[PDB]
C-alpha cells in the first residue's frame, strides 16, 4: 500500500540495486523523493534503520515513510531540491574561504555525530551531499544514500557505540571501522580541497586511468601551492593536508577536523573569492573517476 498514500512520478536515478523516484504525497500535494529497493538483490535492513535512528539530525535526509510489500522496500524521504553541494558551490564565481569553513563545519559535525554513535558513512562522496533547497544556507544541507553505511555491533547482534567496548566485537569488525571512519574524513579532504581550488586532488577529469588515479592515491603527496593555492590560508592547507593524510592511522578524526583553527576561527578567515578553476562539469567526471577507481573490488 505505498501507492494508496503517493502518487509515483519520474526517475531521479536508477541502478543495478535501487531505484530512486519522485513521488507526490496523494493526500497533501507534497513532493518527496521515494528509494525502491529490490530485497531480492539486497538487504535495506542497516540502511532503514540508520536513517530511523539518526535522520532527525537537521543535516542528514530525513526519512517521511517506509513501506515493504514482500518483494520491494520503499523508503520515502525529503526530495532534495538544491542539487549536489559541490556543484553549486563549484558555480558560484564568488565563494570565499570563510563560506567553505562554514560548510565543512556542517558536514563534519554531522559525521562527528555518525561516528560516536558507531555509524560509519562508506560512501561519503560529493555527489552524496545535497542541498534540500535553493536558500544557499549549511542548514539547508543534507547527507544522503546511507546505503553502504554501517552500525557497529557486537557478535551477538548488539549495536555498540566506541565508547562502551565491554561486550565482544570481533578485533577484525573493529579495525574496519577504524578504516572505514578515516575513509569518511579523507572524502571530507576531496571535497575542501576541490571546494578551495575548484579541481579535484587526484584526477583531472573522467578519462584518467584508475590505476593514475590510485598511483597519485598511494603518493600520499598533493599540490598545495600554485596559481589556485598561493592565495589561500596556510591553515586551510594544514587542515587539507591532514584530512588527506594517506596513512588512516595519523589522519584527523571529525572531533580533531572540528578543533582546527580553520574551523574554529572562521571569523579570521577571508569574506573575498576564491580564486579557482571554473569547470565543474571536468570536476564531475574527474570525481567519478576517483570513486570508480577506488570501489573497484566493491
Ligand atoms: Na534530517
Same mark, same amino acid.
Given at each position: ?29 507534497? =513532493? ?27 543535516? $542528514? ?26 556543484? /553549486? ?49 549549511? =542548514? ?6 546511507? %546505503? ?5 555491533? #557486537?557478535?551477538?547482534?548488539?549495536? &555498540?557505540?566506541?565508547?562502551?567496548? #565491554? ?7 573493529? =579495525? ?11 572524502? !571530507?579532504? *576531496?571535497?575542501?580541497?576541490? &571546494? ?15 590505476? =593514475? $588515479?590510485?598511483?597519485?592515491? %598511494?603518493? %600520499? ?10 592565495? *589561500? ?5 594544514? !587542515?587539507?593536508?591532514? &584530512? ?11 572531533? !580533531? ?6 574551523? *574554529? ?18 570536476? /564531475?567526471?574527474? &570525481?567519478?573517476?576517483?570513486?570508480? #577507481? !577506488?570501489?573497484?573490488?566493491?
Amino acid at each position: 500500500q505505498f501507492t494508496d498514500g503517493y502518487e509515483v512520478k519520474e526517475d531521479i536515478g536508477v541502478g543495478s540495486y535501487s531505484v530512486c523516484k519522485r513521488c507526490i504525497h496523494k493526500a497533501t500535494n507534497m =513532493e518527496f523523493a521515494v528509494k525502491i529497493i529490490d530485497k531480492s538483490k539486497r538487504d535495506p535492513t542497516e540502511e532503514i534503520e540508520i536513517l530511523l535512528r539518526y535522520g532527525q539530525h537537521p543535516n $542528514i535526509i530525513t526519512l517521511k515513510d517506509v513501506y515493504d510489500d514482500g518483494k520491494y522496500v520503499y523508503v520515502v524521504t525529503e526530495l532534495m531540491k538544491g542539487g549536489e553541494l559541490l556543484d /553549486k558551490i563549484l558555480r558560484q564565481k564568488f565563494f570565499s574561504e570563510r563560506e567553505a569553513s562554514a560548510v565543512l563545519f556542517t558536514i563534519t559535525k554531522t559525521v562527528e555525530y555518525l561516528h560516536a554513535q558507531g555509524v560509519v558513512h562508506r560512501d561519503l562522496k560529493p555527489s552524496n551531499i545535497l542541498y534540500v533547497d535553493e536558500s544557499g544556507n549549511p =542548514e539547508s544541507i543534507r547527507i544522503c544514500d546511507f %546505503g553502504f553505511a554501517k552500525q557497529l555491533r #557486537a557478535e551477538n547482534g548488539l549495536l &555498540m557505540t566506541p565508547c562502551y567496548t #565491554a561486550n565482544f566485537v570481533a578485533p577484525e569488525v573493529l =579495525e574496519r571501522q577504524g578504516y572505514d571512519a578515516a575513509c569518511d574524513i579523507w572524502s !571530507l579532504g *576531496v571535497l575542501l580541497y576541490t &571546494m578551495l581550488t575548484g579541481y579535484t586532488p587526484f584526477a583531472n577529469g573522467p578519462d584518467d586511468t584508475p590505476e =593514475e $588515479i590510485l598511483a597519485r592515491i %598511494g603518493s %600520499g603527496k598533493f599540490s598545495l601551492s600554485g596559481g589556485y593555492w598561493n592565495s *589561500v590560508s596556510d591553515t586551510a592547507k594544514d !587542515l587539507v593536508s591532514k &584530512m588527506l593524510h594517506v596513512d588512516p592511522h595519523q589522519r584527523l578524526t571529525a572531533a !580533531l577536523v572540528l578543533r582546527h583553527p580553520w574551523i *574554529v576561527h572562521w571569523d579570521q578567515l577571508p569574506q573575498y573569492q576564491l580564486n579557482r578553476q571554473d569547470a565543474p562539469h571536468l570536476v /564531475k567526471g574527474a &570525481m567519478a573517476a576517483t570513486y570508480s #577507481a !577506488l570501489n573497484r573490488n566493491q
